[PDB]
Design a protein around this ligand. Sequence first.
Ligand SMILES: NC(=O)C1=CN([C@@H]2O[C@H](COP(=O)(O)OP(=O)(O)OC[C@H]3O[C@@H](n4cnc5c(N)ncnc54)[C@H](OP(=O)(O)O)[C@@H]3O)[C@@H](O)[C@H]2O)C=CC1
Ligand SMILES: NC(=O)C1=CN([C@@H]2O[C@H](COP(=O)(O)OP(=O)(O)OC[C@H]3O[C@@H](n4cnc5c(N)ncnc54)[C@H](OP(=O)(O)O)[C@@H]3O)[C@@H](O)[C@H]2O)C=CC1
Lengths: 300, 297
Amino acid sequence: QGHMTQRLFVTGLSGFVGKHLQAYLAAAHTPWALLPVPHRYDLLEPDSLGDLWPELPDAVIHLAGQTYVPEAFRDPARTLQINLLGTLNLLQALKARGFSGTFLYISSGDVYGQVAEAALPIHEELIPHPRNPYAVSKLAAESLCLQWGITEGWRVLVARPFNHIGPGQKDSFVIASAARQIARMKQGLQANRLEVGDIDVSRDFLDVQDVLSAYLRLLSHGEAGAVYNVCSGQEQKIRELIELLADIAQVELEIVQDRRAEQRRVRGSHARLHDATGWKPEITIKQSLRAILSDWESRV
Amino acid sequence: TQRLFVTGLSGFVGKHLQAYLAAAHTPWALLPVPHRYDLLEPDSLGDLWPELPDAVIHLAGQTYVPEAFRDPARTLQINLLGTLNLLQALKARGFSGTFLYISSGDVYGQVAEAALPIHEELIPHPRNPYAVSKLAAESLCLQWGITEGWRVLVARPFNHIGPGQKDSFVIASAARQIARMKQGLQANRLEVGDIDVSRDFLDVQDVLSAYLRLLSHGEAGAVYNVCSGQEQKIRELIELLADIAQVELEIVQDMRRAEQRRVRGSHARLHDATGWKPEITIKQSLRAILSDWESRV
Ligand SMILES: NC(=O)C1=CN([C@@H]2O[C@H](COP(=O)(O)OP(=O)(O)OC[C@H]3O[C@@H](n4cnc5c(N)ncnc54)[C@H](OP(=O)(O)O)[C@@H]3O)[C@@H](O)[C@H]2O)C=CC1
Ligand SMILES: NC(=O)C1=CN([C@@H]2O[C@H](COP(=O)(O)OP(=O)(O)OC[C@H]3O[C@@H](n4cnc5c(N)ncnc54)[C@H](OP(=O)(O)O)[C@@H]3O)[C@@H](O)[C@H]2O)C=CC1
């Protein structure tokens, strides 16, 4: 009956993506059985990691870390400690326990930095040029994890996801903030006015569920030692997404000016991930935007 | 004349750089180091610069690969967080000049022979925690160039040769033992690992010259290999040392085969930016290390 089951441990289960992954694994038919977390742990504290795996994971997805760019600029050392030294502490704890399975490190499409429009769509052979300490720490942790795969013989995979859309996303993202505010307009809690910065840029978006499905297909099919973009391959203009949110919400609003963005356009290539795994995006942008508006209605 | 601050002056490369700068009339005046400091201790860094540097060469760190394997965390602390502490100390002092970070050709990792010579557009694949820490510090320094607007340069030097090199390095060890054989202090027998590999070697003086040229003419935000572009078989260099010493040597195996058999780097980018070329032949370098080892014994 069903799948040959494998034990999966996920760090960061309490964060934005983690909560969606736990729900995904509870509802879907998958070979991955999510291991329980025996107690709270801190990646900065090796003694808190010791007994996390009464049953040994066959695979690990490492989501946990300091994920806010302004916080990384505020305290770069702490972001490096959490994202790089924390990853090292996790790797060493897994090693001491006897782990030798699949380790999928979750990086970010932000490692690429400034990319010329002529180099679009971004592919994994483009040399990255991180522009903030968070992106620096992600690229450094990528290298570390892949070095561990070389040194220890583990199956190490790296994913570079681009823009995510989902309930629970950081309010500092313009699309998440726009949805929150529009849901407040629906309920008469704020005027039909949106104060924006530069929204005449395009970015590559995926629903969080398509991002999750890419990670699980990487666990099933990815090549040891390889880096994969996780992206839609489609540019969306921020302004058109805001207009579609208003349309879905049955609201009319004015967008009012609250410095131009450095990177005007971002399109990623997911050819490598699709060729290796069969993965394809399945959630439409309209469904993604409706989902975040609906989530906000029950919270505002 | 511009003020230059160098970390790691007490190390192998830094001692040669201090000597070089005292000898030649370069555009750089080496700043004094007012007190002993520790890159892991931000409070030791604040008063390091009574006069503000115009340029910095960052040599200091944990340079030994077996030590990095022994304690990866410590090597990442020294090489990455130590670099951050230096960047933050300079920023707080008001520095906004040129920062040259010294990385390593070891960041590249495994490279197919058909892909030689190694150029800077090859994606690096570090294979040990030292190389990881160097690649990570490169990205940190270049990110600081972007965000702070400083002129940040990275050099990826390949194998170095010279007096005062770490004794665990194969050529340095061979030269020391052959110098002892010449004096009769050891039997004419040499225990070696896999010496059937080739590496790209430069005399430390040529490496230093490349760094000084980069300070003056490197392009902000760019990475430069610092290498000879010629492969040297370890077995041949050992034979050359014995020939210079006039020692009849016997090489004995100890026993695993090296992962990378051949390494050759391209200095094309460095040369086109700075006109630099190696000036010291491999034989002249080996004479010098042998002759230094002779006085030592
Ligand atoms: N969200 C996005 O838009 C994108 C995300 N990513 C990457 O995806 C991954 C998931 O992001 P997201 O879900 O939004 O992240 P969140 O910030 O929402 O969640 C971070 C998680 O890490 C945990 N964590 C933080 N510090 C530590 C620590 N020192 N020890 C142990 N656990 C710790 C947090 O637990 P607690 O709250 O208890 O501290 C939390 O569960 C990250 O690697 C991120 O960089 C990259 C591209 C896009
Ligand atoms: N030597 C070689 O063959 C190669 C070297 N390189 C790179 O070139 C640079 C110079 O190498 P090399 O001269 O051989 O290095 P050494 O190991 O000989 O010298 C290291 C220097 O760093 C200083 N240092 C170490 N830790 C700290 C710390 N926590 N705070 C302050 N200073 C510290 C040491 O001072 P102290 O003695 O007091 O600890 C010393 O001056 C390094 O970045 C190295 O990676 C590149 C490739 C090959």
